[PDB]
Amino acid sequence: MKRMLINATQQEELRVALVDGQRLYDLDIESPGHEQKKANIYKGKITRIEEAAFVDYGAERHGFLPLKEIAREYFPRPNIKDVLREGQEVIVQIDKEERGNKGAALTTFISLAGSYLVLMPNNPRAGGISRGDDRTELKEALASLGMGLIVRTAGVGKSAEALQWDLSFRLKHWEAIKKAAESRPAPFLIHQESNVIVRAFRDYLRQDIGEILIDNPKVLELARQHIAALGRPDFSSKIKLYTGEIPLFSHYQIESQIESAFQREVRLPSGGSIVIDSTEALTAIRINSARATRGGDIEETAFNTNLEAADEIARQLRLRDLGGLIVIRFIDMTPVRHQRAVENRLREAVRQDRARIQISHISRFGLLEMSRQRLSPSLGESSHHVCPRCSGTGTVRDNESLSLSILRLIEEEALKENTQEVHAIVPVPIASYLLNEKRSAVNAIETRQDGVRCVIVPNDQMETPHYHVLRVRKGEETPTLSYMLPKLHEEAM
Amino acid sequence: RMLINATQQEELRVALVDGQRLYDLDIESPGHEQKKANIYKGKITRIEEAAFVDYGAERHGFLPLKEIAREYFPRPNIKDVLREGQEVIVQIDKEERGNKGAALTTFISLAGSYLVLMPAGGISRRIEGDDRTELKEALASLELPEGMGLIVRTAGVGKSAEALQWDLSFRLKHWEAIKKAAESRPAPFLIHQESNVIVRAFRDYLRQDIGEILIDNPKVLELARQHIAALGRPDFSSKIKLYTGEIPLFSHYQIESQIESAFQREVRLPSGGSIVIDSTEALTAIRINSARATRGGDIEETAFNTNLEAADEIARQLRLRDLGGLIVIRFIDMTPVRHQRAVENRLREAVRQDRARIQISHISRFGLLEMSRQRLSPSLGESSHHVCPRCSGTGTVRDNESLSLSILRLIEEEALKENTQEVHAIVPVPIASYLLNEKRSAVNAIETRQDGVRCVIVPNDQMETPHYHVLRVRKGEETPTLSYMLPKLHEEAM
Amino acid sequence: MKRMLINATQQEELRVALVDGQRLYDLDIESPGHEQKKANIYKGKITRIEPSLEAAFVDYGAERHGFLPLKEIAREYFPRPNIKDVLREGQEVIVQIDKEERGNKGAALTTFISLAGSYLVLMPNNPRAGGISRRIELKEALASLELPEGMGLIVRTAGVGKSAEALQWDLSFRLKHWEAIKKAAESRPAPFLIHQESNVIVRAFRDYLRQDIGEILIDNPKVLELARQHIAALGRPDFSSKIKLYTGEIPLFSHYQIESQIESAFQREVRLPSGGSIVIDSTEALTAIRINSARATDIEETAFNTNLEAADEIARQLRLRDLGGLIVIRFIDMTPVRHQRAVENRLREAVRQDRARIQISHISRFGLLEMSRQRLSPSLGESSHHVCPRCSGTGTVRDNESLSLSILRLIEEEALKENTQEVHAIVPVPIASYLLNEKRSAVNAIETRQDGVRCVIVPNDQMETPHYHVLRVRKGEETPTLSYMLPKLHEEAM
Amino acid sequence: MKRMLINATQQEELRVALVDGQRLYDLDIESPGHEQKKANIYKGKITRIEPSLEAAFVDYGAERHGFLPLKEIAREYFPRPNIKDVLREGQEVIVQIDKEERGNKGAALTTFISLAGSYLVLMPNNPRAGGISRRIELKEALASLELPEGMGLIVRTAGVGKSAEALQWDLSFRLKHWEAIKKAAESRPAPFLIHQESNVIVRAFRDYLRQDIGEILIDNPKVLELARQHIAALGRPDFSSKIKLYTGEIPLFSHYQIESQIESAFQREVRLPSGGSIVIDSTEALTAIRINSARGDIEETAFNTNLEAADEIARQLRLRDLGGLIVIRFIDMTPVRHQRAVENRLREAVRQDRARIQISHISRFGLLEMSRQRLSPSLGESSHHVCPRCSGTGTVRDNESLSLSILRLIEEEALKENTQEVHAIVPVPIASYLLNEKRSAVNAIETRQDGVRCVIVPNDQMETPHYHVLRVRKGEETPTLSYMLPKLHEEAM
RNA sequence: AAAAAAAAAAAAUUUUUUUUUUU
Ligand SMILES: [Zn+2]
Ligand SMILES: [Zn+2]
Numbered sequence A: 001m002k003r004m005l006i007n008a009t010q011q012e013e014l015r016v017a018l019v020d021g022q023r024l025y026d027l028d029i030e031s032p033g034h035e036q037k038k039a040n041i042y043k044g045k046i047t048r049i050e051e052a053a054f055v056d057y058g059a060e061r062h063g064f065l066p067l068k069e070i071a072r073e074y075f076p077r078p079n080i081k082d083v084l085r086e087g088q089e090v091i092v093q094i095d096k097e098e099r100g101n102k103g104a105a106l107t108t109f110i111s112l113a114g115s116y117l118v119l120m121p122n123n124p125r126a127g128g129i130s131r132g133d134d135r136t137e138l139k140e141a142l143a144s145l146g147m148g149l150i151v152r153t154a155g156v157g158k159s160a161e162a163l164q165w166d167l168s169f170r171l172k173h174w175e176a177i178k179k180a181a182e183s184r185p186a187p188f189l190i191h192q193e194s195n196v197i198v199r200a201f202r203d204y205l206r207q208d209i210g211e212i213l214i215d216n217p218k219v220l221e222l223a224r225q226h227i228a229a230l231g232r233p234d235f236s237s238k239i240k241l242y243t244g245e246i247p248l249f250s251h252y253q254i255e256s257q258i259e260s261a262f263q264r265e266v267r268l269p270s271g272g273s274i275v276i277d278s279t280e281a282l283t284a285i286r287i288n289s290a291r292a293t294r295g296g297d298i299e300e301t302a303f304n305t306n307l308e309a310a311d312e313i314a315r316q317l318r319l320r321d322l323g324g325l326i327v328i329r330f331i332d333m334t335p336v337r338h339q340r341a342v343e344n345r346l347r348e349a350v351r352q353d354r355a356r357i358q359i360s361h362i363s364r365f366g367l368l369e370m371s372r373q374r375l376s377p378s379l380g381e382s383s384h385h386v387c388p389r390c391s392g393t394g395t396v397r398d399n400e401s402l403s404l405s406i407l408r409l410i411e412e413e414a415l416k417e418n419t420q421e422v423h424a425i426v427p428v429p430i431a432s433y434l435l436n437e438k439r440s441a442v443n444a445i446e447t448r449q450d451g452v453r454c455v456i457v458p459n460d461q462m463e464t465p466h467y468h469v470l471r472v473r474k475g476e477e478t479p480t481l482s483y484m485l486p487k488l489h490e491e492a493m
Numbered sequence B: 001r002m003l004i005n006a007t008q009q010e011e012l013r014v015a016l017v018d019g020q021r022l023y024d025l026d027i028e029s030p031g032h033e034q035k036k037a038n039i040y041k042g043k044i045t046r047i048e049e050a051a052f053v054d055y056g057a058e059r060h061g062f063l064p065l066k067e068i069a070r071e072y073f074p075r076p077n078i079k080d081v082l083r084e085g086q087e088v089i090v091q092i093d094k095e096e097r098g099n100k101g102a103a104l105t106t107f108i109s110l111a112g113s114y115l116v117l118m119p120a121g122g123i124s125r126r127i128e129g130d131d132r133t134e135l136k137e138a139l140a141s142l143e144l145p146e147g148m149g150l151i152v153r154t155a156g157v158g159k160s161a162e163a164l165q166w167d168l169s170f171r172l173k174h175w176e177a178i179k180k181a182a183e184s185r186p187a188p189f190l191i192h193q194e195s196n197v198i199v200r201a202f203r204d205y206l207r208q209d210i211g212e213i214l215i216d217n218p219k220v221l222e223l224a225r226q227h228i229a230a231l232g233r234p235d236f237s238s239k240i241k242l243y244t245g246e247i248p249l250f251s252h253y254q255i256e257s258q259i260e261s262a263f264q265r266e267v268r269l270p271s272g273g274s275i276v277i278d279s280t281e282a283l284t285a286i287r288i289n290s291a292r293a294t295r296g297g298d299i300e301e302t303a304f305n306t307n308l309e310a311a312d313e314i315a316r317q318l319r320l321r322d323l324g325g326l327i328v329i330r331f332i333d334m335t336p337v338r339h340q341r342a343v344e345n346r347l348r349e350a351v352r353q354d355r356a357r358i359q360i361s362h363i364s365r366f367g368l369l370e371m372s373r374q375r376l377s378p379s380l381g382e383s384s385h386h387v388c389p390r391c392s393g394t395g396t397v398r399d400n401e402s403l404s405l406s407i408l409r410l411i412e413e414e415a416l417k418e419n420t421q422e423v424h425a426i427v428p429v430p431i432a433s434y435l436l437n438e439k440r441s442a443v444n445a446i447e448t449r450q451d452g453v454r455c456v457i458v459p460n461d462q463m464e465t466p467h468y469h470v471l472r473v474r475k476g477e478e479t480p481t482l483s484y485m486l487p488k489l490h491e492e493a494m
Numbered sequence C: 001m002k003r004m005l006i007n008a009t010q011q012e013e014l015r016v017a018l019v020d021g022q023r024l025y026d027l028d029i030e031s032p033g034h035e036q037k038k039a040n041i042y043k044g045k046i047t048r049i050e051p052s053l054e055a056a057f058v059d060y061g062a063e064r065h066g067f068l069p070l071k072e073i074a075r076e077y078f079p080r081p082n083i084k085d086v087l088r089e090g091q092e093v094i095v096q097i098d099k100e101e102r103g104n105k106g107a108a109l110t111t112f113i114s115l116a117g118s119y120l121v122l123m124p125n126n127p128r129a130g131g132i133s134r135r136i137e138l139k140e141a142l143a144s145l146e147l148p149e150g151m152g153l154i155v156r157t158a159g160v161g162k163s164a165e166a167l168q169w170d171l172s173f174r175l176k177h178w179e180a181i182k183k184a185a186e187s188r189p190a191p192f193l194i195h196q197e198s199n200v201i202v203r204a205f206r207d208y209l210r211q212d213i214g215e216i217l218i219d220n221p222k223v224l225e226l227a228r229q230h231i232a233a234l235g236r237p238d239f240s241s242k243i244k245l246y247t248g249e250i251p252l253f254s255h256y257q258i259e260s261q262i263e264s265a266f267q268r269e270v271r272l273p274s275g276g277s278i279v280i281d282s283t284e285a286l287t288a289i290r291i292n293s294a295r296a297t298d299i300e301e302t303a304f305n306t307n308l309e310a311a312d313e314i315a316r317q318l319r320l321r322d323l324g325g326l327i328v329i330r331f332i333d334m335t336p337v338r339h340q341r342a343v344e345n346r347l348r349e350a351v352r353q354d355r356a357r358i359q360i361s362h363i364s365r366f367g368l369l370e371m372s373r374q375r376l377s378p379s380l381g382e383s384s385h386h387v388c389p390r391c392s393g394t395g396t397v398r399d400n401e402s403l404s405l406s407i408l409r410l411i412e413e414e415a416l417k418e419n420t421q422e423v424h425a426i427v428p429v430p431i432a433s434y435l436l437n438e439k440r441s442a443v444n445a446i447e448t449r450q451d452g453v454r455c456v457i458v459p460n461d462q463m464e465t466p467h468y469h470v471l472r473v474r475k476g477e478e479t480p481t482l483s484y485m486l487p488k489l490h491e492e493a494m
Numbered sequence D: 001m002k003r004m005l006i007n008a009t010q011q012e013e014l015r016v017a018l019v020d021g022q023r024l025y026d027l028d029i030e031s032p033g034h035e036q037k038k039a040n041i042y043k044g045k046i047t048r049i050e051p052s053l054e055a056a057f058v059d060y061g062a063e064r065h066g067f068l069p070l071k072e073i074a075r076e077y078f079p080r081p082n083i084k085d086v087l088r089e090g091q092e093v094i095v096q097i098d099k100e101e102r103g104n105k106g107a108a109l110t111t112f113i114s115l116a117g118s119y120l121v122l123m124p125n126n127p128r129a130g131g132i133s134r135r136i137e138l139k140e141a142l143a144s145l146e147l148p149e150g151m152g153l154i155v156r157t158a159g160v161g162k163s164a165e166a167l168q169w170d171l172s173f174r175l176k177h178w179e180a181i182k183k184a185a186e187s188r189p190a191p192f193l194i195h196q197e198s199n200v201i202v203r204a205f206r207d208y209l210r211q212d213i214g215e216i217l218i219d220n221p222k223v224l225e226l227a228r229q230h231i232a233a234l235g236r237p238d239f240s241s242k243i244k245l246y247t248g249e250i251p252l253f254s255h256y257q258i259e260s261q262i263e264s265a266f267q268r269e270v271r272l273p274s275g276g277s278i279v280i281d282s283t284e285a286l287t288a289i290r291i292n293s294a295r296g297d298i299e300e301t302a303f304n305t306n307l308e309a310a311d312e313i314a315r316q317l318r319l320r321d322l323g324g325l326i327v328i329r330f331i332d333m334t335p336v337r338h339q340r341a342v343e344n345r346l347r348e349a350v351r352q353d354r355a356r357i358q359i360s361h362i363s364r365f366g367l368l369e370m371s372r373q374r375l376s377p378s379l380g381e382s383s384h385h386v387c388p389r390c391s392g393t394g395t396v397r398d399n400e401s402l403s404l405s406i407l408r409l410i411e412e413e414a415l416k417e418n419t420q421e422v423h424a425i426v427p428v429p430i431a432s433y434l435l436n437e438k439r440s441a442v443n444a445i446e447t448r449q450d451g452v453r454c455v456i457v458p459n460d461q462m463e464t465p466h467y468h469v470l471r472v473r474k475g476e477e478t479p480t481l482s483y484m485l486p487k488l489h490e491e492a493m
Numbered sequence E: 001a002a003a004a005a006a007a008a009a010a011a012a013u014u015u016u017u018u019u020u021u022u023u
Helices: A133-144 A163-183 A198-202 A217-229 A255-260 A298-320 A336-350 A399-414 A428-437 A439-448 A482-492 B129-139 B161-184 B200-205 B218-230 B256-260 B299-321 B337-351 B400-415 B429-438 B440-449 B483-493 C138-144 C167-187 C200-208 C221-233 C259-263 C299-321 C337-352 C400-415 C429-438 C440-449 C483-493 D138-144 D166-187 D202-206 D221-233 D237-242 D259-265 D298-320 D336-350 D399-414 D428-437 D439-448 D482-492
Strands: A002-007 A014-020 A023-030 A041-049 A052-056 A063-066 A089-096 A104-107 A117-120 A148-151 A209-214 A239-241 A265-267 A273-278 A283-288 A324-329 A357-359 A367-372 A384-386 A395-397 A419-427 A453-459 A468-473 B002-005 B012-017 B022-028 B039-047 B050-054 B061-064 B087-094 B103-105 B115-118 B149-152 B213-215 B240-242 B266-268 B274-279 B283-289 B325-330 B358-360 B368-373 B385-387 B396-398 B420-428 B454-460 B469-474 C002-007 C014-020 C023-030 C041-050 C055-059 C066-069 C092-099 C108-110 C120-123 C152-155 C192-195 C213-218 C243-245 C269-271 C277-282 C286-292 C325-330 C358-363 C368-373 C385-387 C396-398 C420-428 C454-460 C469-474 D002-007 D014-020 D023-030 D041-050 D055-059 D066-069 D092-097 D107-110 D120-123 D152-155 D192-195 D213-218 D243-245 D269-271 D277-282 D286-292 D324-329 D357-362 D367-372 D384-386 D395-397 D419-427 D453-459 D468-473
Touching: A023 A255, A023 A298, A063 A089, A089 A163, A117 A163, A133 A148, A148 A163, A198 A217, A209 A217, A217 A239, A255 B400, A273 A298, A283 A298, A283 B283, A298 A336, A324 B283, A324 B325, A336 A357, A336 A367, A395 A399, A399 A419, A399 A428, A399 A439, A399 A453, A399 A468, A399 B256, A419 A428, A419 A482, A428 A439, A428 A453, A428 C429, A428 C454, A428 C483, A439 A453, A439 C440, A453 A482, A453 C429, A482 C429, B012 B200, B022 B200, B022 B256, B022 B299, B061 B087, B087 B161, B115 B161, B200 B218, B213 B218, B218 B240, B274 B299, B283 B299, B299 B337, B337 B358, B337 B368, B396 B400, B400 B420, B400 B429, B400 B440, B400 B454, B400 B469, B420 B429, B420 B483, B429 B440, B429 B454, B429 D428, B429 D453, B429 D482, B440 B454, B440 D439, B454 B483, B454 D428, B483 D428, C014 C200, C023 C259, C023 C299, C066 C092, C120 C167, C138 C152, C167 C192, C200 C221, C213 C221, C221 C243, C259 D399, C277 C299, C286 C299, C286 D286, C286 D324, C299 C337, C325 D286, C325 D324, C337 C358, C337 C368, C396 C400, C400 C420, C400 C429, C400 C440, C400 C454, C400 C469, C400 D259, C420 C429, C420 C483, C429 C440, C429 C454, C440 C454, C454 C483, D023 D259, D023 D298, D041 D066, D041 D166, D066 D092, D120 D166, D138 D166, D152 D166, D166 D192, D202 D221, D213 D221, D213 D237, D221 D237, D221 D243, D237 D243, D259 D298, D277 D298, D286 D298, D298 D336, D336 D357, D336 D367, D395 D399, D399 D419, D399 D428, D399 D439, D399 D453, D399 D468, D419 D428, D419 D482, D428 D439, D428 D453, D439 D453, D453 D482
Parallel strands: A002 A209, A063 A104, A209 A239, A283 A324, A419 A453, B002 B213, B061 B103, B213 B240, B283 B325, B420 B454, C002 C213, C066 C108, C213 C243, C286 C325, C420 C454, D002 D213, D066 D107, D213 D243, D286 D324, D419 D453
Antiparallel strands: A002 A014, A014 A023, A041 A052, A041 A089, A052 A063, A089 A104, A117 A148, A265 A273, A273 A283, A324 A367, A357 A367, A384 B396, A395 B385, A419 A468, B002 B012, B012 B022, B039 B050, B039 B087, B050 B061, B087 B103, B115 B149, B266 B274, B274 B283, B325 B368, B358 B368, B420 B469, C002 C014, C014 C023, C041 C055, C041 C092, C041 C192, C055 C066, C092 C108, C120 C152, C269 C277, C277 C286, C325 C368, C358 C368, C385 D395, C396 D384, C420 C469, D002 D014, D014 D023, D041 D055, D041 D092, D041 D192, D055 D066, D092 D107, D120 D152, D269 D277, D277 D286, D324 D367, D357 D367, D419 D468
C-alpha cells in the first residue's frame, strides 16, 4: 500500500513523505525562517530592455525575463524593443531566485491549479491532458468546457459537468489574480508560496494513496479543513492521527531514506552506488561497481547494477526535485539490448511523477543525457549555501603552489610605478613558507625592485585558499606594525 | 618560443608561446613528480585473458595477455599461465585510466649509449647519410647476446666504438641487476633513470617549429645543453639561450597572467563571455556564458561568436590543464544548425593541433557536446589541488539549523537503542547553541521519552559546520568524564 | 538575630553561611567528594630520617611520604638533638595531619593528637597544654572535671554559662573517642587511617555552632534529616527545634540578600559604604591589602572613616576567605597616631570575633600594618582558583616588541654557538610578524654575520604572546621538515 | 674596570648598560617613542581649584590634567590655608612634571624647578636647599662660587675633588639656562613647553658618568659622534679620549657576557650563587620579595642566602628602577645580630644609588620594609602591560565554580519583574557545563521563574574568566538565533 | 563492516532496521 507520512513534531521543518509500503517514493521539506528560497510570485515593472528584459519587483536584484516567457498581454520576433516598453507592469513568477550577481529568472505564464484541472489564464494555446481510451474521451470533455487549461491525472474519467464544477473555482482564482494586480498593493500576489497544506497535497496527492498519517493534532485539524476546502471532504476520512513512541518516520523506517536525499552518494542492493555531482549547468551521476566476484559475469553485474541505479536515480530526481539538465554515466554495457533495457527501465521509473522528463539514448562514451521540468529549486542550494572556504570549487589550492604564486604576485605588484610598499596578508602556513623557505626570494624582490617595502603577514582569520596582496602608493605609507594590518582591515574593509 | 622558468627550484615551469599567446604549459614540483612511466614490482591477486596486479595503487592494475611475453608462461586462460600470489615486475603502459589502476606490460626495455636493449631491430631514422653509414659499422661489431633485440639510438652518432663496446655490458648487467633491485627494495618502489623530467620535457614538446628555448636559470641551461649534446644533437643546442633580465622571464613576455588562467575556475573571453570548468568524479563539465545584455546587441552574433571564441579557448585550456578522460561542453543555444556545426568543426580544428588523442561528438538536442582527451598525465586539478577539507568537495554546506535538526534525529535514534546508557553529540559551536537553546524542548523530550538515557551535546572549538560526531555509551561502561572533556578525550582516543 | 543558612539544592557545591540578620557573618563553600586531608589521624611507618633537616619522612598510606619534624615527636616514641636519637627505620608512630597539600609535597605530621568537641578540646598526648579561651565561673567548672591523668584539656568559648555536668558529656565522648583510637591503633595493621574528613556535623557545628544562633534553615530535606540526627547525637535533641526547612520560590540565600555579599569573597576588590574600596593581592608569601578613598569632591575625616570601615570589612573578608599566613595592609595615611591606633583597635575588635587566632603588630613607619592568621584550611584563592596559564600569576604580560627583541637576540646567541647548523624559533603570530618584517633586516644580518646557520621563525596558532621556544640544530642534524611542520612535529614528538 | 656600554645596533630600543668588570652594575633601555611626559619643564594655566584637596589642576597642553598641590606652589604666585587664597582660574605658572601617568589621573607638578649640571645642581626657585652629597678643594671651592642671591645649590657625587674653577664653569651654564626659561615663559603664550628630556646622549652620561669609569664603548658611529660632541659641551672634553667604538662580530653585550644578566631584570625570579632564589611580586601599592632556600647547616645557609639575596635585591632595585614601598621575607634567622647584619648589608648595597632609599629593621613577622624614590617608571610600568586574560589578578576561577555562580546570577535576573528573557554569553566550557551537567537546573529555572526564557550561548570570543548576563524587558524579544546573539551585541554594545 | 544465533518494532510468514553473541 502507498501511504503518506507527515512529521511536524518540530515546527522548524515540516517534513512530508510519500511511501510505497516501506520505500520512500517522494519527499518535500519546508522550513520557516531563513528565506524559503523557492518559487515566489511577484508583481513588477519593466526596467531595462534588450534576448530578455529586466523587471523591478522590489527584490534587491532585478529579475530576468526572456522572449520565451513574454505573454501577449504586453504586445503593442527579432528584438525585445519591438515587443516591450519601459514602465509596463505585469505579475511574474520566479523560477530561479536571486542567485549571485545574476538576476532572478522570471516568467509571465502563471498557472492556477485545482483539484481536477489547472488554468492557464495568460495562454490560450496551452492545454492538454497529463500522460488511451481514457485520455481521448477526457479530451472530448476538456474541449467542451484567452484562457487555456490542462486536466490533471485526478481528472481521469471525470465528466464535462464535474470539470465545470472545478473550473468555477479556477475562474474565481483568475479574478483573484486581477484583484491582486489592480485592486491590491504594488508588490502583492495571490495565495502565496507559504501555504503548508494546499501545495503539499495538490502537487502530488493521487487516489491510490491509502492513508495520511500525521503526528500533530493541531496540524491534522488544518489538514482536514484544507482537504475539505480543496473540494475533497470525503477524502478527509483518510486523515488519521499518529501517537506511537517511536517518531513517525523512524516507526516506518524511512528516516535513513529521507536523509539519503541530502547525501552525495546512495548505495545500491547489489553493492554498487550512485554518486551525484552538481556543476555550473548540469547534474552528473556516476555509477560505481561492487566487487568482481572472482570472475563472475561482468555483463550481468553491470546491467543489474545499472537497473538498480535507474530505479534509484528516478527516485532521487523525485526526492530532490531536481531540474534542468542531467548526465548519467552508467557502467559500460557491450550489447545493445542491455542498453535499451536500461534506457526503458529509466523511462518507466520516471514517468510516474507528473513532471516532464526527457531522455536520450546512451552515447558512444557511455553518457546518457536527460532533462527534468523546472518545477522548483532543488533541496541543494535551498537547504545549503555555497562553501565559504573553497568558494564552491570543491578544491583547495596546494600550499606550495599557492605560496610560490603569491611570491611572484608580490614581485609583480612591486614592479609597479608610484609604489612604496606591498603587503601580502596570508594564512599562517603560507607566511611560514614565504618567510623561511623563500626568504631568499623575498630579499631578492626587495633588492631587485629596489626601494619597495615587502610585508608578509600571518593572519588568524585566514585559511589556505584565501589571501590578499595589496600595494601602497607613494605618500600612503603608514607606521602601522605588520601584525596590526589585519586589525586595521577588519575595520577598513 | 619555449620559455622555461626555474629561478625557483620548488616548481619547474615550462611554457610554449606562439606570439605572446600562451598555447601550452607544464608545471610540476620535484619531490612529488614521478619520473618514468614507472616500473613496479607487484603481486598477482586475481586472475582470469588478463591478470590483476597489486603494485601499491589504490585500485589494482590490469595486465592483459596482449602485454605478457611467453617467457612468463610456466593459451585460453591466464589461470593456466600465472598463479595467485606470484610476484611480477611490470611497467605502467597507460597511467591510471579513469577509476582504474594502470594498464601494465612485461615488455621492459633498457636504454644504452648506442642502443635500447630488448632482453625487434633497426636504427634511429633521425640519423642520416654518412652518419648512418658509419654508425652501422659501429653497430656490426657489438657482441649482443642470443635472443636479445636492439634499437640503435639517435644518441649513438659520434660516440667512439671502443668505450661503448664495453658499455653495452652495463645494460646487459642491469637486466640481471633488476633481480637485485626486486629482492632488496620494497615492491612499490622506483628504478634507475630513463626519465630526467627537464630533458624529457623536450621529448614532450620540442620539435622543429620551435625557434628558440629561453631559460632563466643558468644551471638548467647548462644541463639542457649537456643533454641535447649528449643525445647527439649539438647543432640543435644553438637554439638554447639565456635570459638575464630583472623582470622575470614570464612577466617579460606578459604570459604570467595567462598561466594562472589554467588554475582559475573561470576564464573570460574577448566578446565578454566566459567559460566555467567543473570536475566531477568521472567527467569534466564546461559551461559557456554570454556577456550581460547591453546597448542593442545582436543575439545570434553574440551567441555564435562567443561560442567560437570559447571553442578556441577550451582547446587551449585542455592543453594547458592537461585534462584527460571524458568532457561535456554546454554551448550557448544557437538556432540554425550550420552555426552549431561550425562551432563543432572550429573546436575540432583547434584541438587537432594537439598530439594527444581527442575525440568529439555532435551537439545534442539539449546543447551538450561530448568529447574525450587522452590520459597522458595528471591534470593541474590533481597536481596542484586537493579536495576541500570542509565540505569534502560538494562546494556547498548544509544550513546550520538544518544540519542541527539532522543531528537531533540521529541522537533520537541512538537513544532508542538497547544496551545504551548515554548518547554524546560533539558538534560545532553554533549547532550546540541552536540545539541547547532553541531545541532544548526537544532535547528534554528525548531524555524523558527515551527514558533512562542521558543526552550530552558538546560545543567544540575544533569543528566547522560540515563535521560532527554522535556516539554511544554502553551500559555499565559509562564514564564520569565532563562534557567539555569529551572532545579532549576523542582527539586523542580516536 | 544570628542564623545559620545552608543551601544544598545543587550538589556540585554545598554552601554553609552564618548571617547576622541580613549581614553575612561567616561562610564556607565546599565542592563534593570528601577528599581527606582534614586533621587526619593515622598509624604510620618511619621510612627516611634526616638529622640535617631535623626531620623524619613517614609512609602513612599516601603515595608521597609525609613530613614529621623533631618538633612534633612525643617522648613515648623515644628509645632533644637528633632524629637518629629519637626514631629508627621501620618504627611505627601514631600521627595527625597538621598541614594540607603544599605544592607537590606530602602532608606535614604531628604526634600530638588533639580532639576538639563542642565545648572543649582534649589533649591526650600532652599534659602541659591546658587553659580556657581568652574570649571568656567556668574556671571552677573546669576544676570540677574528672579529666584523666596525663591528659590535658582546653575549654572553648562554647563553654560560656555551661554546667559542670553538660561539660562532662562532651568530655565523655572525646575521651571515649581517644580510647577507641587506642583500641584501633594497637589492634590494626600499621598503614591505616583512624578518622577522616567526611562528617557533615563535625565540619558544620564545630566551625559555627554557638547557642545565640536562632535558627538553622535548610533547603534540602535529605540534609535536614541528617542534621536533626546529628544534633540529637551531640545530645541536643531539644536544639533540633531550631532546624527548619526553607521552601520559597526565591532561593534561600536571595531571600536573606546575602547572595551578593558572598561574591565579595571571590573578588579582587570590594567596595565600602563611604565609597572607598579595599583591594586584596596574594603573592609568593603574603597577602597585601590597599585601601582607596572615594573620588574627590574633608579628606582627613574621609581617610580616618574609610580606614575604620575598611578594618571592619577586612576582618570580615579574613573570615569569609579563610585567609592564612602573613597579611600586610596599606591604610590611608593618618597624621595623628591616636587615630592610627584607633584604627588598629577597630581591627583588633573586628578580628577578636574570629575563633581562628589572629595576631597584629602596630602601624609601621611606612604606613604598613603587619598581621598573621591561622591556616585552618586553604582559602578560596587556593581551593577554588588556579594560577593563570598565560601570565603565570604575575598579572602582567611583556610588550610584544619588548619580547620580540629579546627573542631576536636569543636567536642570535644560539646562532653564535659553534657546531651549529640551524636555529629554530616557534613563536606567536604577532611576534613572528614583528621578527620577520620589522626586524627582517636583523634576521638577514644574523644569517650573514653568523654565517653558515639557517634561521627559521615559525608563527604558531597554539602560542599566545607570553610563551616562545628557541632551539638549536647541531652538525648533520639538518632536516627537510617544513617550517610550518615544526610545531606539528613537536606537538606529536614532545 | 668600570665601563659604560651603549648598544644601538637595533634602533627600536637603545640600551645603555653600566658594568663593573663583567658584573652588570646599572641599566636603562628606552624605545624611540618620543612621548614627552618624562620630566620636561613647562608653562601652564590654572584650570581647576579644590580647597577640599588644598590643590589645583593645571592645563600644561596635555590631554591629561596636571595636579599641583599647595605643597608645590612658590610664594611668587600668591596675591597657608586655602587655594582660593592663593590662585584663580586662568593664572599662568611655570611648572615641572614630577609624576608620570598614574592611571587615568593627572601628572603631578611642581613649581620648584631645579637644574642639575655635571658637577653641581642649581636650585633657582628655592633658597633653603643646598649642601654637599651625603654619599661623598671643595670646602674652599663651594664657598668661592658666585652663586646668585635667593638661589641654592647642591654639590654632586661627581663633584668629588672638582676645582674652584671647574665648578664655576658648570655654574655658568646653570644660570644661563634659568634665563632661557624666564625669557621663554614671559615671551610665549599660556600652555607651552620650555625645555626637553634630550636624554639619549648627554644626560645619559651626565646623570651616570663618574670619573672612575674607565671606558665608554659604543657600537654605532653616529652615536659615538654625538657622544664626543656632548661630552665636550658637558665640560669634560679630555674624557672624549675614553669614547671608543666596538667592532666585534659578537655583539657588545654578549662579548662582556652581561646579556644573560640583563633579562633577570624582567623575570619574576632570580637565582643566587648558593642555589637559592628571590621572587619579586608587585601589587596595587607595594612590591613584595620572598627568598627561597636550596634543598649545609640550615642556620648558616639561611644567613648566607639572605646576604647574597640582599646584594641582589639592591642590584635589582637599580636595574628595574623600582619605586614605592618594598617588603621582604628573608629566611628566618635565630640570632638577632645576623638580622642587623643583613639589614646593614642591604643598606650598604643601596647607599651606592643616588636615588633616595630608606630601610627599616626586620619586623616581628620576619618582614623587612624599605622604600625607593620614583625617579621614573620601572620596567614593569614601561615595558609590560596588564594581563588581558586574568585582568591582572594572576588567577583563573575554576570552570565549575564560575559556572555555578553564573547559574545563580541567571536565576536572580529571571526573578525580576518586567522581564521576558535572560541571555548569558559565556566561554565554550562554561556553556558546556551549564547546558549538560546543570541542564536539570536550567530547566528548573525555566519552570520556577515561569514565562521567562533562558538562553546560554557558547562564544568563540570569550575566555574562561569573562562572561555577560543580560536582561530582556517587555517587548525587547528577538527572533535572532542563539548563535547570532554575540554578533548582535558586538555591534550594539 | 563479514558467517551462524536469539530477542523488539514496523509493511507481505521470508528479504528489510537495531542490539548483542562467537572455545
Ligand atoms: Zn569547500
Ligand atoms: Zn593572567
